[PDB]
């Protein structure tokens, strides 16, 4: 059901989407443990991703989340990285994707920074890295990550320093009380508020 569609790196939808990545890169304060050594990616290619099944799919919750919440789907546009990133294009999000150990519960978990959805990209913690050279900072091997249309809702706001959501609620929104730097992460406990929407296909980048 699934096609991708390559977007030219002169199309202004390939260049906002790049933009988001970039501009969202942070310090972790693992030193790069799990993510890697980087400031910044070297972006190979975007595709959007294109499936009638899943987009309706998606927009039906969404309306459902909608009336529920005064006509406001609460939607954001969010990073989340993933061994199981081929599965999730073909399939969609569902409880095989959920993060059963995270912090908000078992969860399917998104971040507005890239720099910490890169953190997942070969499992938690990093795993043990890229298949090739088992290293999680590789600079070589490619590294895929998803660009999501996310439904929230109304969010539950847990300041921090599957699973259903919080009663009379659609979402958590996990917002940090200690890092200054750090964005919000979010986490969802359907599937069907999520639409993996831009695939990004990139590396980091050793600083200079
Ligand atoms: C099996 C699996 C898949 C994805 C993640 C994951 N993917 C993410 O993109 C992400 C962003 C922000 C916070 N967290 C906990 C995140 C977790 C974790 C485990
Ligand atoms: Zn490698």
Redesign the pocket.
Known sequence: GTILIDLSPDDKEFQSVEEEMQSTVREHRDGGHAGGIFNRYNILKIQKVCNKKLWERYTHRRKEVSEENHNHANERM???????VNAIIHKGFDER???????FGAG????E?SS??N??VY??GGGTGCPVHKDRSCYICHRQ?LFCRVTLGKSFLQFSAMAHSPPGHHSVT?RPSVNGLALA???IYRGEQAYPEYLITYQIMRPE
Do not use: D
């Open positions: 969010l990073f989340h990285g993933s061994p199981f994707h959920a993060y059963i150990g995270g912090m399917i978990y998104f971040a920074n910490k959805s953190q997942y499992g938690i990550l996990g992460e979010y986490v």
